[PDB]
Write an enzyme that holds these catalytic residues in place. Sequence first.
Site, PDB file in Angstrom:
ATOM      1  CE1 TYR B 508     -16.865 -17.882   8.603  1.00 49.38           C
ATOM      2  CE2 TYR B 508     -15.604 -15.857   8.381  1.00 49.38           C
ATOM      3  CZ  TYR B 508     -16.555 -16.741   7.892  1.00 49.38           C
ATOM      4  OH  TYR B 508     -17.202 -16.494   6.707  1.00 49.38           O
ATOM      5  CB  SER B 591     -22.440 -17.431  11.920  1.00 44.35           C
ATOM      6  OG  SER B 591     -22.747 -16.114  12.354  1.00 44.35           O
ATOM      7  CE1 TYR B 592     -17.686 -23.887   8.853  1.00 43.27           C
ATOM      8  CE2 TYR B 592     -19.397 -23.449   7.233  1.00 43.27           C
ATOM      9  CZ  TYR B 592     -18.383 -24.254   7.715  1.00 43.27           C
ATOM     10  OH  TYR B 592     -18.052 -25.402   7.052  1.00 43.27           O
ATOM     11  CG  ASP B 669     -30.712 -15.615  13.881  1.00 38.94           C
ATOM     12  OD1 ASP B 669     -30.632 -15.284  12.670  1.00 38.94           O
ATOM     13  OD2 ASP B 669     -29.720 -16.002  14.549  1.00 38.94           O
ATOM     14  CG  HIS B 701     -27.223 -14.092  12.523  1.00 37.20           C
ATOM     15  ND1 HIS B 701     -27.429 -15.326  13.116  1.00 37.20           N
ATOM     16  CD2 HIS B 701     -25.983 -14.066  11.983  1.00 37.20           C
ATOM     17  CE1 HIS B 701     -26.326 -16.017  12.884  1.00 37.20           C
ATOM     18  NE2 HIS B 701     -25.434 -15.300  12.198  1.00 37.20           N
TER      19      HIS B 701
HETATM   20  C1  LIG Z   1     -18.201 -15.897  12.115  1.00 32.06           C
HETATM   21  N1  LIG Z   1     -18.520 -15.397  10.771  1.00 32.06           N
HETATM   22  C2  LIG Z   1     -19.401 -16.168   9.978  1.00 32.06           C
HETATM   23  O1  LIG Z   1     -19.813 -17.249  10.372  1.00 32.06           O
HETATM   24  C3  LIG Z   1     -19.635 -15.595   8.688  1.00 32.06           C
HETATM   25  C4  LIG Z   1     -19.127 -14.409   8.310  1.00 32.06           C
HETATM   26  N2  LIG Z   1     -19.472 -14.077   7.035  1.00 32.06           N
HETATM   27  C5  LIG Z   1     -20.248 -15.069   6.618  1.00 32.06           C
HETATM   28  N3  LIG Z   1     -20.851 -15.172   5.345  1.00 32.06           N
HETATM   29  C6  LIG Z   1     -20.594 -14.223   4.255  1.00 32.06           C
HETATM   30  C7  LIG Z   1     -21.724 -13.206   4.155  1.00 32.06           C
HETATM   31  C8  LIG Z   1     -23.085 -13.896   4.057  1.00 32.06           C
HETATM   32  C9  LIG Z   1     -23.239 -14.915   5.171  1.00 32.06           C
HETATM   33  N4  LIG Z   1     -24.545 -15.630   5.057  1.00 32.06           N
HETATM   34  C10 LIG Z   1     -22.086 -15.915   5.081  1.00 32.06           C
HETATM   35  N5  LIG Z   1     -20.354 -16.048   7.591  1.00 32.06           N
HETATM   36  C11 LIG Z   1     -21.160 -17.275   7.553  1.00 32.06           C
HETATM   37  C12 LIG Z   1     -22.527 -17.114   8.176  1.00 32.06           C
HETATM   38  C13 LIG Z   1     -22.988 -15.853   8.567  1.00 32.06           C
HETATM   39  C14 LIG Z   1     -24.256 -15.678   9.094  1.00 32.06           C
HETATM   40  C15 LIG Z   1     -25.091 -16.757   9.256  1.00 32.06           C
HETATM   41  C16 LIG Z   1     -24.657 -18.026   8.915  1.00 32.06           C
HETATM   42  C17 LIG Z   1     -23.401 -18.184   8.353  1.00 32.06           C
HETATM   43 BR1  LIG Z   1     -22.891 -19.934   7.826  1.00 32.06          BR
HETATM   44  N6  LIG Z   1     -18.295 -13.675   9.142  1.00 32.06           N
HETATM   45  C18 LIG Z   1     -17.711 -12.401   8.712  1.00 32.06           C
HETATM   46  C19 LIG Z   1     -17.951 -14.177  10.396  1.00 32.06           C
HETATM   47  O2  LIG Z   1     -17.202 -13.569  11.143  1.00 32.06           O
END
Ligand SMILES: Cn1c(=O)c2c(nc(N3CCC[C@@H](N)C3)n2Cc2ccccc2Br)n(C)c1=O
Lengths: 727, 727
Positions: B508, B591-592, B669, B701
């Site tokens: 992550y 995601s990240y 997405d 997503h």
């Molecule tokens: C792997 N991974 C994530 O990358 C992650 C995450 N929670 C978040 N965020 C907080 C809630 C709002 C969210 N936009 C950001 N992210 C970052 C993200 C999410 C979706 C799209 C791009 C990104 Br940059 N969790 C829980 C997790 O597991």
Amino acid sequence: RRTYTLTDYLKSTFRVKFYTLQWISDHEYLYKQENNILLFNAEYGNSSIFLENSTFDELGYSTNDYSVSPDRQFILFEYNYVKQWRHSYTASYDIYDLNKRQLITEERIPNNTQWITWSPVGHKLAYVWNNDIYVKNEPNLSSQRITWTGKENVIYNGVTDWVYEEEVFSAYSALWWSPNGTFLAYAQFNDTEVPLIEYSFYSDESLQYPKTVRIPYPKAGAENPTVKFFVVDTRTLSPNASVTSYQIVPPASVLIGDHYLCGVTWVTEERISLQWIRRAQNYSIIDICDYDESTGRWISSVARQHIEISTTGWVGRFRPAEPHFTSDGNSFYKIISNEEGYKHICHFQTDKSNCTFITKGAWEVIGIEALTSDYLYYISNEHKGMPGGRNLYRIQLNDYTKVTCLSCELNPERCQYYSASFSNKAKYYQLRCFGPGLPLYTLHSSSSDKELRVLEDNSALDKMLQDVQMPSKKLDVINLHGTKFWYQMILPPHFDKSKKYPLLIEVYAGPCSQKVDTVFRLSWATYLASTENIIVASFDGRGSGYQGDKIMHAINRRLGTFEVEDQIEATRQFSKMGFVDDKRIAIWGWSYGGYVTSMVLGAGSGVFKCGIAVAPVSKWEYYDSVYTERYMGLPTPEDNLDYYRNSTVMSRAENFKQVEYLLIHGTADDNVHFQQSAQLSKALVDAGVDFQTMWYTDEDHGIASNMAHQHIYTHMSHFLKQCFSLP
Amino acid sequence: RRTYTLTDYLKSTFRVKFYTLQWISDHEYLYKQENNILLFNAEYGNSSIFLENSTFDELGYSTNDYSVSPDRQFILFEYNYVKQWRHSYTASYDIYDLNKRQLITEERIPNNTQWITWSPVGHKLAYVWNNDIYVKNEPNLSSQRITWTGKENVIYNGVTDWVYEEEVFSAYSALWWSPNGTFLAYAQFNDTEVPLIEYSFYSDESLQYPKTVRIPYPKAGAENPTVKFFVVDTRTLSPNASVTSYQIVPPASVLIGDHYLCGVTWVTEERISLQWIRRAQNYSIIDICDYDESTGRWISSVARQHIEISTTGWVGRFRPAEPHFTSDGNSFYKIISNEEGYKHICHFQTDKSNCTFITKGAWEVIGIEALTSDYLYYISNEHKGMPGGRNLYRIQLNDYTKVTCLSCELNPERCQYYSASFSNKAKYYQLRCFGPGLPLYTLHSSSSDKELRVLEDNSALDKMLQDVQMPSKKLDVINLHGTKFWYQMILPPHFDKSKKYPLLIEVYAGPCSQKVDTVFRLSWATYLASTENIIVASFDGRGSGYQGDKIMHAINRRLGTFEVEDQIEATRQFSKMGFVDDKRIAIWGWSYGGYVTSMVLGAGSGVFKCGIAVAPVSKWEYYDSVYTERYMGLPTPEDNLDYYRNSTVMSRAENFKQVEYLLIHGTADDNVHFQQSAQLSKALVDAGVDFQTMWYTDEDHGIASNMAHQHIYTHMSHFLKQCFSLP
Ligand SMILES: Cn1c(=O)c2c(nc(N3CCC[C@@H](N)C3)n2Cc2ccccc2Br)n(C)c1=O
Ligand SMILES: *[C@@H]1O[C@H](CO)[C@@H](O[C@@H]2O[C@H](CO)[C@@H](O)[C@H](O)[C@H]2NC(C)=O)[C@H](O)[C@H]1NC(C)=O
Ligand SMILES: *[C@@H]1O[C@H](CO)[C@@H](O[C@@H]2O[C@H](CO)[C@@H](O)[C@H](O)[C@H]2NC(C)=O)[C@H](O)[C@H]1NC(C)=O
Ligand SMILES: *[C@@H]1O[C@H](CO)[C@@H](O[C@@H]2O[C@H](CO)[C@@H](O)[C@H](O)[C@H]2NC(C)=O)[C@H](O)[C@H]1NC(C)=O
Ligand SMILES: *[C@@H]1O[C@H](CO)[C@@H](O[C@@H]2O[C@H](CO)[C@@H](O)[C@H](O)[C@H]2NC(C)=O)[C@H](O)[C@H]1NC(C)=O
Ligand SMILES: Cn1c(=O)c2c(nc(N3CCC[C@@H](N)C3)n2Cc2ccccc2Br)n(C)c1=O
Ligand SMILES: Cn1c(=O)c2c(nc(N3CCC[C@@H](N)C3)n2Cc2ccccc2Br)n(C)c1=O
Ligand SMILES: Cn1c(=O)c2c(nc(N3CCC[C@@H](N)C3)n2Cc2ccccc2Br)n(C)c1=O
Ligand SMILES: *[C@@H]1O[C@H](CO)[C@@H](O)[C@H](O)[C@H]1NC(C)=O
Ligand SMILES: *[C@@H]1O[C@H](CO)[C@@H](O)[C@H](O)[C@H]1NC(C)=O
Ligand SMILES: *[C@@H]1O[C@H](CO)[C@@H](O)[C@H](O)[C@H]1NC(C)=O
Ligand SMILES: *[C@@H]1O[C@H](CO)[C@@H](O)[C@H](O)[C@H]1NC(C)=O
Ligand SMILES: *[C@@H]1O[C@H](CO)[C@@H](O)[C@H](O)[C@H]1NC(C)=O
Ligand SMILES: *[C@@H]1O[C@H](CO)[C@@H](O)[C@H](O)[C@H]1NC(C)=O
Ligand SMILES: *[C@@H]1O[C@H](CO)[C@@H](O)[C@H](O)[C@H]1NC(C)=O
Ligand SMILES: *[C@@H]1O[C@H](CO)[C@@H](O)[C@H](O)[C@H]1NC(C)=O
């Protein structure tokens, strides 16, 4: 010795030279040699510099295309080339005065000019800018606006819409000057009611938000573009005068429903031939209209109307064949299907319904090349009964028994596939030999049929290929359901019949296709056979072209059936030969060939281990109206819905569980939309089938950008080697 | 013995049971058991049927959600569930009168209702329909229109726009009733100037032309939605009366530029707390507004304003922490960073600037759960100095030295990760244990802290797992640049230290991320360790959360640097251990985590053989403004354009030549646009790099549709096995 490598193919290290010429008289032609435009005289052999390469270097831009005015007083220079679809492009144009050796600076051709053409005589110009037509009687003079209706994505004047370009004309142009430039005939396409195809274009990395491309594209059964055909009298063109034009409507027999304008042919200055086809495409009509001097009208007559129908399928190959008129215009010659189902030349009288077949046999005429008062020149696959061969023939118009093959025995081992280009009065011709050996370009006199000279013999390529272990291309026949069908095999070097080789089927198999021919190619198959020791085979079964309407129309109203089934049965026979490893068989293809590959892989035959489908049609309701309906009819329960329904790749999703599948598609595909592949993958995901994908961002139907082209064949090579357990 | 397989994971054959309850009083809760809504009494242990499952079967639709009015006179039934984004959905609603045991047939809630909520007392309803607010004082009575401005994709009243839902509120709702339902506070989001994200939605196979989805989505540096906050006096709601509303504007310090409303907290009936943050997100201000009875105004005071500033990074974790007010509303408790950089509870006075820290230590407070006149209940990671642990603590408000850990030693080996749900006056609490052992749900009394009962002990799961060779989850520490960081390893069964196992890194690594914790999971990693004998490790380095601002803010204005570098150095250390095959190390993320995986693979370290990036960010300028600007600032040359520029995955394209890369993305997405992977693949194609892709048609997503979810993990399992030379 070295082999023909992937790098060799992708970087085009082995160059196939050609000879492109532009006939500008009955005995003279223009040729671009080392960026110099040379004027060659066929009559004496001698050449002179028409335009020096030093003039190109001072232009300030790269000259990708040139067009000399028929009177040789001006030259049109194409620069700022912005490609649109398969044949369409918008560019910037410069006119260079050849008399005063100056460049036209005043009243220039505007930027984003869609199409431009000289008149067939003099130096008049007709161009399309912002979907409207403009005429310049003089290159230094102001242009005269012909049309006011032009509207982006809606009304097209003098240029085709998406579907007319791709499927009807195979050209962006919808402008036709009369022989002496008195009249400028043009088509108008109205796309108001045509639904839009929308897809994302991502553009350069710096573009923050993707743009949405919107194209009026009619899918099978959707609302089609309408056409209007006009003839403008260019003589009355004056700044303070209205445009004199006459609208020619189709005959009542096609005008009663949805139709297409599929051909325009000027016969004389006062006689024009229009070829109309009904939306069904099993009914075509030639309407020959005569100019009335007292009224300015273009009058049609029932006597001058010529119907062409098909009861077994569609009219022509991809469209009805074009009429080839005599100088007087009182008679014409056209390729039509005979009583036996073979495409041959029929001689028609302009005011009579009956025609006389001038050619006959269990072979077909490909095209009428030239027509003089005494002779007609044509291309056919008659020689050695090979449908994959092409030769130039000349027939005597006063005695149809007197037929001479002009190219047959020139180089019988090296040359079996020919094309020809004739001079203005068919006094000279260039012969283009494309294989089986290295391509050979030669010039001939029509009077003596003597070879004047060798224009290009590819001797530089011959020297290069001596140092390389090249594969061998074998053409042969097999019997499927009592019919003899043709196949080809690219065989690896030092081919041992005792050794068992992996096999890759390269497929097209579309209606009127020909994957099996004698054309020489430096393809991906050359690399697979030379470096990877893979046999690359192709096969033409039911639905293939140039072998009669019985074979061609076999897949009428049932695409995805016989042509798919024949690819499987031909491979079963190829595998019976002791030189094929039955455990290592693959199939691949592009467009229609991608669909066939997928329908073959979804057949559950057990023959194929893997396959690669590149930009394939997955469901015929997604493809364009003109192509699709020609073979399938309408997707209504009244017509062919049932066969549209069971011909999707998606309906065969469960069988893909037995194969390794690679599905490739460009995101910016305007022809076979990405939708086709996106709907196919979705069905395989829903069926629980594992497969591989590869999208190509901003790539269109060709996936022809230098970087994408290299990437796709490197990706496909890795997949095949993985599948065939090759290092 | 059998192993935990891919089928076990995908088909969820091993079920992790939970206990969901709804506290409806200080001593009562509602529980859905065998589709019956049972009312449990915590005070005596006994339960009664609140609503029989026989009432559900006669409704005529599936009841996915229920909401009882606070006065227990009515029950709201959710059916026709149509999911939109992460938290948003439109549904059809029915009201069932619990007194007369009848259903409401007249003046029903309309179809496509975006959001609906009961008042905190009685049975008033506030709902959102066609972006407008409607209030029903009685469920049988006609609704009263609150807003007239609502417009699809433009104006949103009472519901969040795309970015407020995803990044600010983490909820679709933007409606807040006052404690006794006098006032209905709401936000209005104006997306007029916000650019649209457009992408194709292909829909069912039968849909001939794809549809274009258009969402107002602000990318980094783009025009942001504007917010208006109003308080409506529901008392004057009458059909022939205007709406009485007062617009509360942010304080001048936030109002001077682009801002966000990040929190709304009703203190009393005449006192509301608004939390505003500047667009930069390093300046936050709590504005406590008081109702003026004589004018209807909500008056703010400088004395009642509380500023929270960050010079080292951003305010809060993902947003500033919410204030927790006393019943009187004269003081509040809020989590803020202390002098040492750790998040602890500060006690503030409503009309004073100074605060007093009530907690301290090299650990952090996660959240304030409950607040009484005598006690404050909170979750923290203090126990055993484990930042990946969570425990419930109670602090005495008159003596901050008196701190009790309510959950720490209940089941010390089985339970280290806790969550809590308190009753209306914090008299009872449910404790939710999530690991390391099987999840355990229990009921407790706040007075004695005695465990009243075991709600769910997952004994059925314990019995099932006894016959399966389950992997072991080991949590430990490693030193990176003098700092102790946490890692976890899912180790295969019968783990042999002499054998060299392939290693998979699950990442992550995003700002405030925590991949390393004591949560029990039946994940894909369980299968990889159990069946495939792959060690699955995770690591939390610089930028990770719950270990102070020093570690968390380390990646401020430099995403893709330290957190990427730490994933590489941690893996180098893991590989030094003699039980890891250095030739077989992979990395994967979503995601990240996908962004990090792609940055790690493009780092050219030689550590990783392969990697999988699922729906990754590739370039921060493509991601939304709220999340991106919080860590990166603005992408202007005046601000942080340089670090935006060199943090793209595309800039590292050449290094991918050393690795096997699988890039996955959903075409539909809304969060991380397909554009990101489309732009990344294009750069890899331009760099001449081979890699693998996998698009998922119409998937968003989550790629969470039953068929897509199964397909993705089956595809990644095949890729990993190919990479690790596993059968
Ligand atoms: C792997 N991974 C994530 O990358 C992650 C995450 N929670 C978040 N965020 C907080 C809630 C709002 C969210 N936009 C950001 N992210 C970052 C993200 C999410 C979706 C799209 C791009 C990104 Br940059 N969790 C829980 C997790 O597991
Ligand atoms: C411009 O024209 C000259 C010919 O006048 C070109 O020169 C020939 O180039 C080819 C290819 O390199 C050589 O094989 C010939 O031997 C050259 N001929 C002569 C007479 O030198 C020249 O290449 C052209 N330049 C450009 C930039 O197009
Ligand atoms: C669509 O359905 C037709 C009718 O069932 C299929 O045609 C039959 O195919 C079998 C071989 O599978 C032949 O034995 C029959 O003679 C065919 N019947 C007719 C009426 O032609 C057809 O194969 C199906 N199309 C596809 C693409 O699967
Ligand atoms: C939403 O925001 C827009 C601005 O983006 C507001 O529109 C402006 O309103 C003023 C006054 O009515 C006009 O003078 C401007 O020309 C408008 N600008 C644009 C771009 O339309 C709009 O009033 C806001 N709507 C709501 C309901 O708050
Ligand atoms: C963007 O460029 C800067 C250039 O300074 C990179 O920062 C350096 O990162 C290395 C990592 O090994 C450090 O040794 C330097 O001290 C850093 N310099 C500064 C000024 O901080 C940064 O890492 C690059 N970003 C990415 C994503 O590669
Ligand atoms: C055939 N044909 C036309 O010849 C044509 C036209 N619209 C115009 N105009 C151009 C805009 C300015 C307007 N005064 C005339 N004209 C040219 C014209 C007409 C009649 C008399 C003299 C002239 Br000059 N349309 C729409 C059309 O169809
Ligand atoms: C493989 N393969 C083809 O599949 C092929 C083709 N020529 C044609 N057509 C005639 C010209 C107009 C064209 N729309 C149809 N097709 C079919 C096709 C082309 C592109 C997209 C979808 C399809 Br369906 N050739 C030359 C070839 O090689
Ligand atoms: C607060 N608020 C309103 O209360 C409001 C409104 N527009 C309307 N109407 C809609 C159509 C009926 C017409 N009377 C104006 N009203 C309701 C109303 C106004 C004044 C007197 C009685 C009433 Br009933 N706007 C735009 C707004 O902002
Ligand atoms: C070729 O030679 C003849 C000699 O009579 C001459 O008339 C002609 O113009 C020459 N052609 C070229 C292209 O130089
Ligand atoms: C195009 O077609 C529409 C009907 O679809 C018609 O109203 C319009 O006038 C046409 N335009 C032209 C220039 O023919
Ligand atoms: C055409 O009309 C314009 C005025 O509209 C005038 O300036 C010009 O002289 C006219 N041209 C001719 C050839 O009479
Ligand atoms: C042309 O096709 C239509 C539709 O399938 C059919 O009704 C008509 O009879 C066909 N005409 C011929 C000559 O086969
Ligand atoms: C309904 O509740 C009864 C217990 O009162 C239970 O036996 C039954 O299985 C439940 N039925 C459904 C459909 O949940
Ligand atoms: C539980 O028992 C008490 C006994 O005094 C009773 O008053 C109460 O109503 C019962 N609660 C429930 C939920 O059945
Ligand atoms: C509200 O106004 C309507 C007419 O617009 C009228 O019929 C109704 O009686 C009014 N209600 C009250 C409470 O006066
Ligand atoms: C907050 O962030 C902005 C933009 O990055 C910056 O200009 C400003 O100085 C920062 N303020 C503080 C208090 O950090």
